[PDB]
Ligand binder design. Structure first.
Ligand SMILES: O=C(O)c1c(F)ccc2c1O[B-](O)(O)[C@@H]1C[C@H]21
Ligand SMILES: [Zn+2]
Ligand SMILES: [Zn+2]
Length: 229
């Protein structure tokens, strides 16, 4: 099920959806896997999250060229940390239109990231303002509230059973909520639950640092976050 491609791993999750995985050896954490998504929509490819680095992100684009061979119409990144946004320059070098939460773009320089070219804004109920996410096809972008970070966003894939929680969601057996350095501890549980409520049909939950899981990832993440209050 896993395809090794250079130093990256790709896993098909649905007829039109693949998970990309890249690794960074970070001092104190080991070699951390980070996951994003690749979605074919008709004659276009859409990407969710970069790899950790520009070089790894260029390798994602190389895999897409070899395995799908359709243009990458856009990428959306899910917050301003390196696992999600470290490869922005590779997307720009490739001519790909890039999107992030407006707040992610504002935070990018101080986080050591390069901003995306376009900013998403969100209605009070969390759904993206559609004018700011043109041509997103089946990608349904939802801001669940502050959690792992204040700017974290999530993405469902219409027509599939898949939703992507990024670094907000940890797997159903996780022992901790990971890196809480920029987290909103009081609102985390509610934000995890809001993600689940936004995508009630999603039976496959994809996340940054573990393999795809059932919705027990959502309930378990929220239950762990209940203890932060
Ligand atoms: O998502 C996490 O919880 C996480 C972690 F547990 C360890 C290290 C990192 C994490 O994500 B990050 O904050 O986005 C960043 C790349 C670093
Ligand atoms: Zn993060
Ligand atoms: Zn992370």
């Amino acid at each position: 099920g896993d395809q090794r491609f250079g130093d990256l791993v790709f896993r098909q999750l649905a007829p039109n959806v693949w998970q990309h995985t890249s690794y960074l050896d970070m001092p104190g954490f080991g070699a951390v896997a980070s996951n994003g998504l690749i979605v074919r929509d008709g004659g276009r490819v859409l990407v969710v999250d970069t790899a950790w680095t520009d070089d790894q992100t260029a390798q994602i684009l190389n895999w897409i060229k070899q395995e799908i061979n359709l243009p990458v119409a856009l990428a959306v990144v899910t917050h301003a940390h390196q696992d999600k946004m470290g490869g922005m320059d590779a997307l720009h070098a490739a001519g790909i239109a890039t999107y992030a939460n407006a707040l992610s773009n504002q935070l990018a320089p101080q986080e050591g990231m390069v901003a995306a070219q376009h900013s998403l804004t969100f209605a009070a109920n969390g759904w993206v303002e559609p004018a700011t996410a043109p041509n997103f096809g089946p990608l349904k972008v939802f801001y669940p509230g502050p959690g792992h970070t204040s700017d974290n966003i999530t993405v469902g894939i219409d027509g599939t059973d898949i939703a992507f929680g990024g670094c907000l969601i940890k797997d159903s057996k996780a022992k901790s909520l990971g890196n809480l350095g920029d987290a909103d501890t009081e609102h985390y549980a509610a934000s995890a639950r809001a993600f689940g409520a936004a995508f009630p049909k999603a039976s496959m939950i994809v996340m940054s640092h573990s393999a795809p899981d059932s919705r027990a990832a959502i309930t378990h993440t929220a239950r762990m976050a209940d203890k932060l209050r």
